[model samples]
Target: REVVIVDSVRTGLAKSFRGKFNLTRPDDMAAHCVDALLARNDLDPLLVDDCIVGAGSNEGAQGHNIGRNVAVLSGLGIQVPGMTLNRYCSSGLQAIAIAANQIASGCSEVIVAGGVESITLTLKSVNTDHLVNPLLQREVPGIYYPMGQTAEIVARRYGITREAQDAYALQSQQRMARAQADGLFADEIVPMTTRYAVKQVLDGVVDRDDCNRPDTTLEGLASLKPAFAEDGSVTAGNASQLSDGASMTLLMSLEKALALGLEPKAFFRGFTVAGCEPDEMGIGPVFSVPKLLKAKGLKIADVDLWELNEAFASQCLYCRDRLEIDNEKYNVNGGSIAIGHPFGMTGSRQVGHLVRELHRRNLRYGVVTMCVGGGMGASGLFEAVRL
Candidate 1:
């Protein structure tokens, strides 16, 4: 029984600050991706069972069941139902897992799973009205710390050196540069339209990622000062960049796909989610990945490519060393350190890239994994057609 990935697509990675996508809403970006994916795959929206959306910061315009808004606005048929999930940064990957679980269990045949985030439009804990009792604040004081502080915890606890972190950052820039030069990301990215209004309104499509600096090197990264602390190791050069984007995939049962004359490029293999203590949340993948591989009876060698999210250079290195993954196979074409991290959108973007790379090389299997903000990590494995 094969669960096939019928279609996948993602928007260009927009830098969080002053990027073309910064002004857009998350659901709107997701709707754009959905439209592009369906159009490219020639999918009939009426046949879609449901739309599963993931969000990290669920507030403001992105709140109140935003997934349904994206599905409706994506130009899908009115019959499709949509729902949202938030497992922090891993939300998108978890949504895909849930969709696959339903199909694998004979619950539904066709589904759409993806994630979107516009960190520029919404900040963390967006509703600052302060509704909770004052006493509860002390109980969860750790939640207020910014993400960089958390990275410091992983760095110190894991004994990750500044040299190692800078090297990883440099490698990411080089890898992303090579991938762009080789056109490895061309198929996976669907550009978005942006509008500007001043005295007169203007609108147009934006096709390129705005965050990548192809000339970045270790010396450039090392010269930068720490952003999280006056004397902290977490520098702007090595930390994950805030970004905006969306990614989505159309999934269907093998029988359903065949009936529609559709040939899936890959199959949803398996997924796993695990939680850890929040203080050490950045390394949650350390616990989740082993469990996922064991459950599927998969060894590290079985995977041809890996897209582990680069939440921070430290976390990326910590997880890689802990998992003992081969550096050559991990994020071979770059990661968040170069392209940027769009919270909930990271997992789906990783999956989209993985599928495209696997197809390009005529390979078999790949993995998309990400660590979450709160205390969880999620992963999705896929098997591509072997040439």
Candidate 2:
């Protein structure tokens, strides 16, 4: 029952509210990718055992079990059960790992795993209003710290300078621009129609991601003021921008994929999710990356490409320095600073990026990893098809 990935797809990331996808609901956003995955690969929806969604903010517009909602909305089936998970920013990627574990352990045959988050429609940092057991709150204050504050902590602890942060951000934009220009991302992107309220108040569907700024520069970043800390270095220029998007991966048992006459794109090599203190959660990759490689009997140099989620410039810089990642082999197309960060969807987005990057470079090995809230870190390893 070894788990194998059949295919994956993702909507182009858009800036919150101002982006082309502002009017799309998180559920619909995810369903679009699900539809694309099934249609492009000639998959039967009923064969899916279950669906999983990872969402950072799961109330209001994104409330309820988004996975099941999307399944039904896409006309999947009422019998197809679904679950939602929140491991902070790592939810989406973790969902895939969980699905893979279930298949490998003989719990299910075919499963759909992914997540979506739309900051334009969902409230940010809103309380759950649950009667906290007082004990829980007292036990973990890092969980309560705003994401901005966490960025500040990383910046201070890592001694990441403002200049370096700006440089990292600038590089991200430049690299992404080059990738887009070269159409390196063509196969991975699921171009969606984004409906938004227009000037007359009528809604209209727009095409393309709105936040891809190709003309970004370090001089422009240096001129911006700090967003989280008044006297600190973290700024709007360096911190990841609020974004909206969705991603999905279709996985099945190796036998099932072959039975369906589908050539497996790649197989799940190994996965790991670790927890740490919240304040330093950004360093989660510093811990999880090595562990994932170790578990797979591989080395850092063994990975041909890497996709480390760029939650913040400071955190990304810290991870690169601590892990001694070769710049040329890591996040070669830019990261959150250039695109945008949609909490629950980030992890899967990294996976999709890594897959495409591996293919583009004609490499065989790649890794996807990210830091999550509440001191959590997650990573996954994959081997590209030799063909």
Candidate 3:
């Protein structure tokens, strides 16, 4: 019942509304990842059982079952069936898990699973006319609370100071800048061709650093005012910036890998999801990480790397403290805080970052996790393939 990852790849994340993917359709970006993943491992397009894609918002070009659209759009062709799903921030990882579950059950041999998003093209609102679920809004209005408001709630609940939040955000940028300079990310990104030089609604905010603001300063971050509440600690500088990108993972049963003469580089251990209060969604990882580790019969220290989405410094910091994970082993290459959060793309994207480093550093175990919207969290456990 084992599933293995043959390969994974991502488009370079660009600032939302004003960067590389501004005008690009989500399917096009997904196809690039699909092509790169297939070509990288020499996977035959027809062999894939399904193409599973995730998007928080399905509207406009991202609508009409994006998975099917991407299959027709890519080299996957008419034969390959496709599906689309949504689990908000965890959609990407959930897609991967669904693929893995199917493979492990022996119902499929190969699957292409991932996620894509274009913040410039779609809106992720829970209050849209047909989109609004009346009961959820009536009984649990917190379900639709602005995400920043939840960050502020987590900060207030845990007393996560603005100083600490600002400091962590600075470290995030510093770590990402160093990783980019060292070429550590060289192999992880697939070059995305851009049509427009200026991506600001096709307007004008030139981007050279992607979303990693190397120019960020603690003083600058501290000086920024609260974004959600009158005296709130959460600010834009301490939060994950909206981003645009897509990431894909190729998965198959271990027996299938051997049959195909592919050297699988990572093991798909397992994935877990947990729920909490919608108003305090930021503490989701606090509930999910323990549940995952316990299920695997491991302690927090057994994991070599932790890639918790930096949804907000306050939330990430709070979860890290509650979980007792050492700073040294967590997000060593930075996280969404600096690299940007492409919503649906982050979960699938994190696999590449975690697996590569685990092998490079000669480590064994790693975990990719994120605090999801709608009061849920997800964690995926993975292992490096030494052979």
Candidate 4:
């Protein structure tokens, strides 16, 4: 059976946890997205067999089988079962992959898959109650280094300059501003209505992403101090913002979609994950992208567009130069640097963006790739099924 994405939707990317989405939890954001996706096509809730949500930090409201709770809260019905998974930053994409696998295996006809994160409510950190081994830390101290520090390592190893990073960050902001002004994001974003407090409501649509700094300049970026290292080149301006948001995609067997008179936006080709040294975790795409292309008998040039998560300017520059990716084909609408990275939501966000852009531009192949935390990398390939 062929698996395809019939529709996808995402809430506006907020700049910080306390930004636009502070009023909502991850579950609320995810439920709202799922509801919008179903409403767009007038899809029946009972048609969905399962829901899989990805969460990097699954605590607070996001914990205790949050996927199932989201499905129920979205009015998906009691018969629909759901679960959650995590693979750090790749969790959202991983959720989609699992749904695709189920469809391909003839287990179910339709499934909902995506991810959500409320970084303001639950910040990134290992549980303090968990036991740690001093010996392991001594042997592999890089494993404990902050993500920004890892970006520094990549910059030093790959010879990426601070100037280059700042320039790229500026480009991201400029491109994102242009895209937003042109209404390029209108098709993918699902407007959200946030509740501020008891008996208080923000009665307007939250439609625009809050992360892009239209006023961003190279000079401004250069003036920012290094985030994780005293001598590090990676600055706050070049790093992905801590954000809160949710995103989801509806997946089904091609036959089922056709029976329902639904047109698919894109078809899943394949995906790959790779592991690397923890210290240089930012180089993840360097190892994973080639593996995915080689498996699909494709070259870097074969892909029409590449959605590489800009976790940091340093890492992004290293991957682009080392892989020889064309600037024109990569992140044409900007990326995490400008759009915000809500951890678990980024993978699905990338998929939603890529599919819509591919269709809009009448393109064929697109790749969504990201560097994972804990020394990992992941890449997913998709083919647009033009209407």
Per-candidate TM-score against the hidden true structure: 0.94, 0.94, 0.95, 0.96
**Residue 291, model 2: Cα distance from true site in angstroms:** 2.0
Off by over 4 Å in 3: 124-127, 197-209
| Candidate 1 deviant stretches above 4 angstroms | 130-141, 197-204
Writing each residue's lDDT as its tens digit, candidate 2 over 1-387 gives 567778888888878876667678999988888888889889888888988889988887788888889888775768788889898688878889988889998879988888899898885546658735567668887777777788889999889999999998888888889988888767767887655754634444434445767888778889998998789898987878888988888888888988999877777888887877787788888888888988889988898888888888999899888988899998899888878889888888788777767776789888888888778778899887665
Q: What is candidate 4's lDDT per residue for 151-270, written digit by digit as tens?
A: 999888888999999999998999899999999999889888775432455544568798789999888998999988888899889999887899999999989999999999999989
What does each candidate score in C-alpha RMSD?
2.1, 1.9, 2.3, 2.0
Ranked by TM-score from best down, the candidates are 4, 3, 2, 1
For model 1 the local lDDT of residue 124 reads 52
Show the lowest summed lDDT stretch of 10 residues, model 3: 199-208
The models' CA-based lDDT, in order, is: 0.82, 0.83, 0.87, 0.88
Q: Which residue segments of model 4 deviate by more than 4 Å? A: 124-126, 131-135, 197-205
Q: Which stretches of candidate 2 lie over 4 Å from their true place?
A: 124-128, 131-139, 202-206
Please state the error at residue 160 of candidate 4 in Å: 0.9
Alpha-carbon shift of residue 71 in model 3 (angstroms) = 1.4
Winner of 1 and 4 under TM-score = 4
lDDT top scorer:
4
